[PDB]
């Protein structure tokens, strides 16, 4: 087997090597900003014929921003149907009200944590 | 040999404590662990809010609730008088054991060290410190804790008393309508001289 | 009968921890002591800086470093994944014993009390407090400590997790070029419900 | 089997400590409890003022007193050199036992973890925290605590040392002429690696 | 026995009932602001003839305000000969001095604690 | 033996006495501001002929002020070749630079601790 595969949500533990012998194991770990959820594997062994066993990075999900309920008399909607970082939250106030603290928040990654690009807005009487 | 712990057991299915008087039915889930360590008792305590009302206090600028715990002459929780509505017991995995409590007295706050009605030693009946509510935006919100060890008895049955009281009063509430969820305090560990068995 | 302590041993010859990522080779000497006391574990921890770079952080106005500790299904340190690059063991005088660890699981932070991926109980995975760096002019410089008990697993091996993180951000750094020396934190002792053996 | 506690006994009849130098005869009643818990020692301490002078410090805006405790090569209190003028002993109900102390060394602050005259490890000889004097109007007055574990020996007899020091310096004194009474600190519990038996 | 008696410094533990059988016990607890002092009872049993045994609320004393010594060169006197709440403390300064911070404090109940309605006065030279 | 000898860095534990019998021991303790360093003794016994055994106060060294490295582009020099209290630290900046925060610090005793009379200076570009 040659240098193990690389992934987007999971990286290799330790420095890679050019060649690998049969029966050798290589381990990965969810990258910064991701986390593990059983039961999928994050390691793989170099079998008889020098091609690693099947392996994915699907056991590693992105960190999510905290929950945000609808701002009284308004509505908060996960623009991208997800709280995961790399996405956004949108706010539309109801008919008789108007929105103040502008009305898009971006769930972004900051270090090892997903956090909203700001604070929820509010709806007022009009 | 888990008879050195007298605790509520880890995270109980249903709420076991009724902290809010403006309430009825057990509004929260009080976790308490008393461990015999030398001539002292290590008290480990915090609370998991369960009822919507209690959980919504985090949206308030100035709060404080108390958990009153009374025990009788033998070291047994007085359930009708206390906030903790269900007895404590020894360790059995992550749960309360189910049998006779071995030397409960031993876990009670010594009346010798913390007396009743002695105004000249009153000051000696208090324990203070800080726990933290971990807010939505992940910031640490400090909560003040006062602890009174059996100073005032409530009637002819209460032989010992432990009253923990959390509080906070700042410019802003640790939460807001859209972000609120559960009211949880971080473990607060304190110490006290124990009564003799 | 020192099988109630699972610790790094007292002040190790060479650095045992690599806290700074901007680093390689073990920049400090992390001292850690977990003692079985009742249904709880008493965690005692602090750090002795060894490498010049780490020691020089005290000249900075806003810092924070983390010590990530992962254990497997049996309670054994995952050395390649953790900051502590050398296993823990039982007490043997002031040093780590050299043999099979008796009931390591017993020292791990209970998954029942501190779960994995449960956003409804997330708040329950945190511990906070303060330690103090004792500066040159002998003043006590407070350092903030956050502790996360196994909330996020790092892969299919990490069965438990303990992540301690020190930080400070004031108007002035706790030191200055001419006065700096070693970066040392005072013992920070915290508590947590332990997993069952 | 109370040989895991080496303490002053609960609330002593007569004062046992002489904290104020501007004094003579034992001005207060120092309560101290060292319990063997794993490779660590749990130190529990506070003070009950007895003499009118000491009790009147609460009327002062800036105070601080120290309780110096020295032990010999065997773990025995050096009474003539220490503030605590009467030996410690094992638990016997709420009182000090009366016999040979079993493994006193075991309760001493490890010289390996807290050394003597090592300026490169000096910072490692300190412990800090807070206790609270509970004032008349029931408010909690914080008092600063610094602890130095055997760094400087006082002569050829002092093999170990424990120096606790309380202090406060605010805009107003925690009391006033008409309200003052007794000076009492809340239990302050700290931890340290113990010497080997 | 019919609904247990009611008291001013002691209240009934649990909801009362219209009828009670022989040998039944009912317990009280000092009200908010009071405390217990042995050895008087705070419970009673419904005897053979359906009339509760004798019972009082004298084991429950009122919470008291902290002590207050005479303000240097003046005098503090418990107007009502008691520190208990529901009463007051009076201050008269001595002849050559005059009183400043007015000179009545009311020991009042606030929640579960008796506290002075303010702060002691002081006496100055004149 | 008559009243034990007195020393500058070590004082007598307990009140002295006019006369002392053979075989009696007297103990000293480093004074405030000093500390002990093995292995020299700090006690002495009154021998057969009533003259104490030899004894010194050399086991007691003075408390020292913290260390002070050269201020970037300048030099800090222990004027008296010691950090011990009762001495001073001097600062000369290098040629192309000038000194600001004046340039003598006195390691002084304050209570039971030796501390610098101030803060180190710094050197600037000129
Ligand atoms: C998260 O959901 C939001 C909402 O659907 C997505 O952001 C929006 O994406 C659209 C198209 O992808 C952007 O539209 C562009 O607008 C310009 C002028 O406004 C127009 O000329 C272009 O032809 C195009 O339609 C829109 O700007 C953007 N909204 C914001 C806030 O900038 C986003 O793509 C979703 N994220 C992911 C990863 O899918
Ligand atoms: C606590 O002790 C004080 C002092 O004795 C009592 O308060 C005072 O009570 C008297 C009579 O009960 C009040 O006097 C009234 O004064 C008005 C005019 O000042 C007069 O016209 C009435 O005929 C009557 O004499 C007096 O106002 C009151 N003092 C204060 C501060 O208001 C009090 O009664 C005692 N408390 C109890 C529960 O006994
Ligand atoms: C610590 O080292 C310093 C530096 O050598 C010593 O302080 C300096 O001591 C000298 C002589 O002992 C003092 O000199 C005097 O100066 C005046 C006028 O400046 C002159 O008229 C006298 O004839 C004399 O030479 C000098 O003032 C003093 N420097 C300072 C900062 O005041 C000091 O003696 C050493 N300490 C010990 C204990 O040795
Ligand atoms: Ca994927
Ligand atoms: Ca009555
Ligand atoms: Ca000398």
């Amino acid at each position: 087997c040659e240098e193990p595969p690389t992934f987007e949500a999971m990286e290799l533990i330790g420095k890679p090597k050019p060649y690998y012998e049969i029966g050798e194991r290589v381990d990965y770990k969810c990258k910064k900003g991701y986390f593990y959820i059983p039961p999928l594997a994050t390691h793989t062994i170099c079998d008889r014929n020098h091609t690693w066993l099947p392996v994915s990075d699907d056991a590693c999900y992105r960190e999510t921003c905290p929950y945000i309920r609808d701002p009284l008399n308004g509505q908060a909607v996960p623009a991208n149907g997800t709280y995961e970082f790399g996405y956004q939250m949108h706010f539309i106030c109801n008919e008789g009200y108007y929105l103040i603290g502008e009305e898009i928040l971006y769930c972004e990654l900051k270090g090892s944590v997903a956090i909203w690009s700001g604070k929820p807005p509010i709806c007022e009487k009009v | 040999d888990n008879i050195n712990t007298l605790w509520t057991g880890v995270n109980p299915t249903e709420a076991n404590c009724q902290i809010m008087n403006s309430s009825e039915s057990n509004d929260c889930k009080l976790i308490l662990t008393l461990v015999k360590t030398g001539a002292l008792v290590t008290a480990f305590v915090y609370v998991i809010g369960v009822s919507n009302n209690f959980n919504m206090l985090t949206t308030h600028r100035n709060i404080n609730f108390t958990a009153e715990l009374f025990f009788d002459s033998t070291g047994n929780l007085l359930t009708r008088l206390s906030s903790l509505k269900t007895p404590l017991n020894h360790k059995s995995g992550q749960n309360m054991a189910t049998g006779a409590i071995t030397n409960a007295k031993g876990f009670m706050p010594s009346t010798t060290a913390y007396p009743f009605n002695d105004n000249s030693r009153e000051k000696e009946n208090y324990i203070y410190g800080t726990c933290y509510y971990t807010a939505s935006d992940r910031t640490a919100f400090p909560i003040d804790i006062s602890v009174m060890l059996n100073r005032r008895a409530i009637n002819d049955e209460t032989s010992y008393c432990i009253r923990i009281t959390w509080s906070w009063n700042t410019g802003d509430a640790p939460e807001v309508q859209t972000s609120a969820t559960t009211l949880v305090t971080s473990p607060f560990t304190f110490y006290y001289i124990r009564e003799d068995d």
Side-chain angles (χ1 to χ4, degrees), chain B residues 68-72 75-79 82 84-88:
Chain B
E68 291 183 293
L69 279 44
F70 306 85
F71 307 73
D72 62 19
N76 302 86
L77 185 49
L78 274 2
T79 2
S82 308
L84 177 52
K85 297 308 192 176
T86 152
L88 303 169

Side-chain angles (χ1 to χ4, degrees), chain A residues 62 78-82 85-90 104 106:
Chain A
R62 291 188 181 190
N80 282 293
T82 172
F85 66 84
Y87 297 111
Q88 45 208 185
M89 178 65 83
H90 288 176
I104 291 196
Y106 308 84

Side-chain angles (χ1 to χ4, degrees), chain A residues 7-9 56-60:
Chain A
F7 307 84
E8 172 187 346
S56 67
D57 49 297
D58 300 323
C60 297

Side-chain angles (χ1 to χ4, degrees), chain B residues 147-188:
Chain B
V147 176
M148 190 189 96
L149 298 179
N150 62 218
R151 168 171 167 55
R152 294 306 204 198
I154 256 319
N155 64 38
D156 56 5
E157 288 282 280
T158 59
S159 296
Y160 304 83
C161 316
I162 288 182
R163 301 176 172 82
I164 333 282
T165 161
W166 291 267
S167 52
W168 73 71
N169 169 37
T170 42
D172 304 292
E175 285 304 350
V176 282
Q177 49 152 177
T178 65
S179 56
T181 48
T182 295
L183 171 57
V184 169
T185 56
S186 50
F188 174 70

Side-chain angles (χ1 to χ4, degrees), chain B residues 6-17:
Chain B
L6 178 58
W7 72 344
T8 61
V10 187
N11 179 47
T13 296
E14 298 301 329
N16 62 333
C17 185

Side-chain angles (χ1 to χ4, degrees), chain B residues 6-27:
Chain B
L6 178 58
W7 72 344
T8 61
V10 187
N11 179 47
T13 296
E14 298 301 329
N16 62 333
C17 185
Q18 180 180 68
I19 265 199
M20 286 192 298
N21 194 200
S22 354
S23 233
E24 175 106 42
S25 84
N26 300 25
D27 25 62

